[PDB]
Ligand binder design. Structure first.
Ligand SMILES: *Cc1c(COP(=O)(O)O)cnc(C)c1O
Ligand SMILES: *Cc1c(COP(=O)(O)O)cnc(C)c1O
Ligand SMILES: *Cc1c(COP(=O)(O)O)cnc(C)c1O
Ligand SMILES: *Cc1c(COP(=O)(O)O)cnc(C)c1O
Ligand SMILES: O=C(O)c1ncccc1CP(=O)(O)O
Ligand SMILES: O=C(O)c1ncccc1CP(=O)(O)O
Ligand SMILES: O=C(O)c1ncccc1CP(=O)(O)O
Ligand SMILES: O=C(O)c1ncccc1CP(=O)(O)O
Lengths: 396, 396, 396, 396
């Protein structure tokens, strides 16, 4: 974006605003445009726009002035060519898949894929004849193999993963894929464009869930997809049809929340790391998952491709479904709810929160244990948070 | 909804508010809830919810207090069992189709189908092996024939139609379809739940584009699908995956706009009718399309299943692409833009506005003429509008 | 404003938007500008603005792009030279008084003055030595007398009045006051800029409470003051110091609500009138107050300076505090609350609602009877409303 | 507030929300309540509320659910008994002055008082016979003298001061005042409830300007007044008449902004201090103002009653009106505008920005030099900022 703006924090603030907005004003902030359509002065100009000689969104489903600002902002952060914003993260992945993978094509992902996204790939895509290969996050051989057996169209995965924060060597993975013509998409939701530049490491596309860290206030939903124009534009087209447009009000709520992205992330990164160690050393804590820890499987990877390790920390308590529940019920600061990344701390038992519909055996079939607890550290003072977590574990 | 409320106008105002809200308040209006998730007091309760013993949206993608109000509101008007709201009309149709029509299945629609909706059906659905039969809005024999030849899954169409406002005998069409097991979905955007009750006439589902008349202020987009629970719920499920959630801020903007629905519709209904006749009798106007006119192909049907004929009026000027434009360029009150149904009057040349990408020949291939002009009468004073249209016509 | 615009309805919609906004956009609606300050490109320009060579609001407390629109909009309706918008109606009257009336000066108002306003004039102004003469709305002799005895600075009153909707011959009163140099300010809240033009009748300043009819949806508070520049500017200056600025989000909610002012007012005007007569003829109704009725004291004046008679109707039930309450408690459509002018209907007993702090004797000291009931007719269907009122009247 | 939260940061986040809201929900954030009035179920209950047996706001001008949350939140931070929120900072001071000081009373303030506030005290208050004594911020003897000569009603001042960030020994000043029965009001705007607790130091009332640091995003205006109930309630009463109510939307924007108050403040405190030194050592900088420096007149006081020194830094460049301007015109990150405290950095020449109307002689008569430059450090990265300031300093 700007030369005088070299830090990501400065970018997250003035990116797409300080130098101009396209919607002129002497105001410091971006104006919210609540319009469903855009007019033209005369039929002559309408034709001009229709003939690529003029610029206009024409209709609200094809864009919005207050929305593009956030599109450019995130684009600068990720250092992408273009960024597309949708109603939600799910909408982003969904549309992207439906737009890039052709019928009958093949897809490759990890076993730790977000549940809902797994369902979409195992129940909807097959309808278009799309087949998929599910490998382990670390199993690079499996990827290389599948890369040769069938013709892979695109390798999709998130890093860190949910809920075990498993990381993928983006640089490597990308190289293997591009070697066989496969595409690579990374869901850096947990990471944040501040803790890692998936695009700079080789990924073709990087999508986020503004609902989490980008918004950071737990009050709005949004989808994010950044990458090269040639690509992002293909998705944008299908988007203009499926109509999963983001409301201008929401767009501003995110622009606003991003003004303090770096500040929030910085604090969440510490509290998370510091509390992880404390938890790891705790006698009542059986296992702790965090890329920052030395005990993490891909700790060497995370350390090589990340500058931070996120504010999300998962760990298994030394008890059972009931005891573990007793622990979370004891906390007093975090909310017992889904989602994560907001100023307010949140806790939940993935076993109950997102897999209660399955049987204990089917649950265990995929790592989720009644022991697993996912803590999303807010922005509250460390001491207050630490004391709370400890006070809770005591009752166990 | 209420017994003391026997009129749609009264309903559109208090339906889903006067009796209760689920979100208690001594406030007259519905509170906007800007949240991404919902918390639980204790693991115990969380389980209860998961075991269908307690109620909660859990996550913002699965619902919202300020959104269900609008959902119940619209459900009362259409006299439906349940209503689902999306980010936009296109999202509504799109999701509904992907959810109800199975792979390899067959679909039936009209030739006047909304352009973008046509594209989705002719380029995306085929990927799932879904084939379609396109018939003329009036050709009931074609429908009956198709109903017997191939196994029709669902008959989709809008009524009135765009831009020639063609109408379908909903009652009849429903009968034929249901006889063969087909589903019927009517797009009553142009109509409005006030001018007709597609659900009462026999349709299974009725969808709208709150972006138009329901909102009425040209400042927000939204999708609408009302129908039986068994059906609408199936859609809601795929919706929870595709993630086309509607923002609470937008949901309120619609709730508010609907408070004056009946009043707006009433006025537009008149302005349109009166202006249509005046236009028809005008020497410079070659043809006029409006269900309210006796010259309309299905005026008899419109008169039998409608109480109003919308505020949209299409007509052909006595000139060419250039002359017609000169007419619209002379208008001073309406805006030259897409969309319709807002308090502000709008005008456009479908030919240019939504078919400029096609050749003159390919355009004529489907009724669109450089002569056609679609007028969306706002809520301005009739005399002011009439005088403007006349003064303008006085130039061609 | 516009030449092609000759009807208030059309004006209330496009006034201050259709021709230009000062904040350029190809958007149909007015954009919301959420800013606390406005920047300058270079010290040179800042100086220009300070030297009155350039335009700018500088600070949010001094103006806002999305607010002026509303200022100009209302200015057109009242045909005023300039309009000022504040936080609330009380804010407007308050600031206006403090600004125009000098210390030790004298004021003249009616006995039916709005309570709160009465308190301000009887407890605050005296601190600045400002004395006041209170006369009866109709007593023109008293006004003329006071006009000669003391040196009146400004005559302030509302018309219709609350809650007895008393009217004042603006034309006459204005004439008498201007003869002695006194200023005249009318509070046309109940009337609405559609039902009467106080400015055209001779008044110097006309103020409203957008909170009521202008907003029309019972979801925002705002003040209104329209009149000559020389005058309104003087108020604006004190405003910039007392800081009762109006939030941009609020300004838009009103701009939006006004797009259907004429439509709403039209409907309320009828329902009110019709329901007034029905009520008058009812055996259980002792008295009914409404300028539209022939039994109203200033019906001849109302009939001469108004085109409508508002949507507010006051009447006394044939019972007591307890009985009358039983009546309002029987209603099902209207809300038991203060305020009026919104789409939703509202009822209340001034006695209890705004005079419960006074003794029965002190209450009757100024017309308020435990009998009095103020009905604010919403926009719901007449039949639904009528049936409701009549039904609850069969339980007395 | 809470016993498990002892840090201000955690307080600024959950204060007034984590334990309850008064407006029940399972939502994590506070709901925005857009309503002008509040209803009652039956006349019986209406009476209960009027007789202090039930709770209700009755009318929007008297309170709002989404507003009180902010009232209680700031109350916790300041450790006050109650907080009142208005439309703007000016409103707060103005109303607090008109409510606490009686007619003919005496007031005491400093020479560095906020300009607009000075005007109000020097032009409006005298109309009520209220006289004032202006002393120098440091001059304690003057205060002690004035405290004995005339009968001081209230001593009002800010600390730090604008623009020379002069500080006042709150503890001391409080003692002398209370000894003679005077009241003490501190405008801790520049300080922020995080850097100092004027209330705990002895102040009777501490008022802010949420428009600055509290909101921290330069997109909303708001006034703050915290202190004991007996006192704050007296103001709230006059407030209910002057009608400077705060819009719920604005209230939410602050509640949200305060979620990252500590984070923002923390960063701004550093940058400012660090840059303050570098600037002081700079050869082109003649003088620097900042309570954090050892060169500041009341650095010993600042150090004893503050934990931070604000993000505002004033300094004089080695040049003239024209040269100084050249420097600000060279900057690229901060905006040239009024206000301060937001994420975005801002700069201005008080001489031009707020004193251009006065003569060079009249300006200097009160310290304002054509040299003075007030820098409001945003939240951008220090390095980026530092480099910018330096770069524009070499242009000189
Ligand atoms: C948040 C999230 C999503 C989906 O985001 P929505 O906002 O719910 O649409 C998908 N994947 C991961 C890994 C997430 O954390
Ligand atoms: C407006 C409209 C749609 C699509 O609405 P969106 O709000 O753009 O999704 C579909 N069909 C018809 C007939 C419409 O008029
Ligand atoms: C509504 C009203 C006011 C004050 O309006 P607010 O919105 O409460 O500030 C003053 N006078 C009359 C006659 C009103 O009806
Ligand atoms: C910002 C400020 C005020 C007034 O704030 P407004 O938002 O302009 O009302 C008063 N005093 C000081 C010292 C301020 O910094
Ligand atoms: O708890 C979760 O796993 C989660 N994470 C992110 C977004 C939403 C959720 C909730 P779920 O999938 O159970 O519907
Ligand atoms: O102009 C139209 O046909 C129209 N109508 C309704 C909604 C949106 C549009 C614009 P588009 O060309 O992109 O289809
Ligand atoms: O009921 C009323 O008198 C009324 N009217 C208009 C606005 C507000 C009110 C309520 P209050 O008693 O507080 O003055
Ligand atoms: O620049 C200022 O002095 C300032 N400070 C705080 C709030 C507002 C301002 C702008 P003004 O010139 O009008 O006083």
């Amino acid at each position: 974006y700007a030369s005088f703006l070299n830090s990501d924090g400065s970018v997250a603030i003035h990116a797409g605003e300080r130098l101009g907005r396209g919607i002129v004003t002497d105001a410091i902030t971006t104006p919210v445009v609540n319009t469903s359509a855009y007019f033209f002065n005369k039929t002559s100009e309408l034709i001009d726009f229709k003939e690529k000689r003029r610029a206009s969104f024409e209709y609200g489903r094809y864009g919005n002035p207050t929305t593009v600002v956030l599109e450019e902002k995130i684009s600068a952060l990720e250092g992408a060519e273009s960024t597309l914003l949708m109603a939600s993260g799910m909408c982003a992945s969904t549309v992207m898949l439906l737009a890039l993978v052709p019928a009958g094509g093949h897809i490759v992902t990890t076993t730790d894929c977000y549940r809902k996204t797994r369902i979409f790939i195992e129940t909807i895509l097959p309808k278009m004849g799309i087949t998929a290969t599910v490998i382990d996050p670390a199993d690079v051989g499996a990827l290389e193999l599948a890369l040769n057996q069938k013709k892979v169209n695109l390798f999709f995965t998130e890093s860190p993963t949910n809920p075990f924060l498993r990381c993928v060597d983006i640089e490597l993975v990308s190289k293997l894929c591009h070697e066989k013509g496969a595409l690579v998409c990374i869901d850096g939701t947990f990471a944040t464009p501040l803790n890692q530049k998936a695009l700079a490491l080789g990924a073709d596309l990087v999508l986020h869930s503004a609902t989490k860290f980008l918004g950071g206030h737990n009050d709005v939903l949004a989808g994010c997809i950044s990458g090269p124009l040639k690509l992002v534009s293909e998705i944008r087209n299908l988007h203009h049809i499926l109509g999963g447009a983001l409301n201008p009000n929401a767009a501003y709520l995110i622009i606003r929340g991003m003004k303090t992205l770096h500040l929030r992330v910085q604090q969440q990164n510490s509290t998370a790391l510091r509390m992880a160690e404390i938890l790891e050393a705790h006698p009542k804590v059986r296992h702790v998952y965090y890329p920052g820890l030395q005990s993490h499987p891909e700790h060497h990877i995370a350390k090589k491709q990340m500058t931070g390790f996120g504010g999300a920390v998962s760990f298994e308590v030394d008890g059972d479904l009931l005891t573990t529940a007793k622990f979370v019920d004891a906390l007093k600061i975090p909310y017992i709810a889904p989602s994560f990344g907001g100023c307010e701390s949140i806790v939940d038992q993935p076993a109950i929160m997102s897999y209660w519909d399955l049987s204990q055996s089917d649950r265990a079939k995929y790592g989720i244990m009644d022991n697993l607890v996912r803590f999303s550290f807010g922005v509250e003072d460390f001491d207050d948070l630490k004391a709370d977590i400890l006070q809770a574990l005591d009752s166990i």
